[PDB]
Amino acid sequence: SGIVQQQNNLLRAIEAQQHLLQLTVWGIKQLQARIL
Amino acid sequence: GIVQQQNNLLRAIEAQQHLLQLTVWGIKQLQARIL
Amino acid sequence: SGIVQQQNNLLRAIEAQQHLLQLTVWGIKQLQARIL
Amino acid sequence: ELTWEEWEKKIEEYTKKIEEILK
Amino acid sequence: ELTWEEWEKKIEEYTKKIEEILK
Amino acid sequence: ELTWEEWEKKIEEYTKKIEEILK
Numbered sequence: 001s002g003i004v005q006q007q008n009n010l011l012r013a014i015e016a017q018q019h020l021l022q023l024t025v026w027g028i029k030q031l032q033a034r035i036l
Numbered sequence: 037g038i039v040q041q042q043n044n045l046l047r048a049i050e051a052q053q054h055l056l057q058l059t060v061w062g063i064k065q066l067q068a069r070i071l
Numbered sequence: 072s073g074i075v076q077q078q079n080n081l082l083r084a085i086e087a088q089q090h091l092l093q094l095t096v097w098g099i100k101q102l103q104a105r106i107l
Numbered sequence: 108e109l110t111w112e113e114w115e116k117k118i119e120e121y122t123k124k125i126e127e128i129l130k
Numbered sequence: 131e132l133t134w135e136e137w138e139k140k141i142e143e144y145t146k147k148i149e150e151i152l153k
Numbered sequence: 154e155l156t157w158e159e160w161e162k163k164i165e166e167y168t169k170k171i172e173e174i175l176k
């Protein structure tokens with residue numbers, strides 16, 4: 001719709017991707033500890 | 037303009053989502069190998 | 072303040088998330104080389 | 108602390124949220 | 131199945147694409 | 154080339170920067 005709504009949608013998507021990025025950090029650290 | 041910049045942001049987020057699909061894929065590959 | 076400022080903040084956030092994502096790629100490659 | 112099963116479920120949940128926005 | 135070689139190529143492609151958008 | 158210790162530090166540095174931006 002408008003720019004204001006679309007800005008909010010982009011913000012929510014980036015916030016959710018930050019959670020995904022944190023989850024990938026956790027998985028890498030888990031495997032690193034197992035391997036090394 | 038703001039309209040163009042908003043579209044570029046969407047395209048970056050879509051590409052960042054593809055990257056996340058790839059890193060999740062790689063973590064799952066190693067996890068299944070290890071555990 | 073306004074949409075212009077908020078849009079700039081989102082750009083900086085994704086720029087920083089890309090650095091974070093590149094670091095996760097490095098960690099995955101390190102572990103991949105160790106395992107395989 | 109997470110089990111790998113919980114990790115996978117949260118990945119799916121955040122993906123669903125994002126794809127709803129991208130759609 | 132995806133190979134690690136193509137995985138690495140696709141990572142580079144999307145990362146380069148974002149870098150060009152942000153410029 | 155990074156050590157894993159340096160990797161962990163930069164992860165946290167970028168995480169804090171993002172979280173501050175997202176408020």
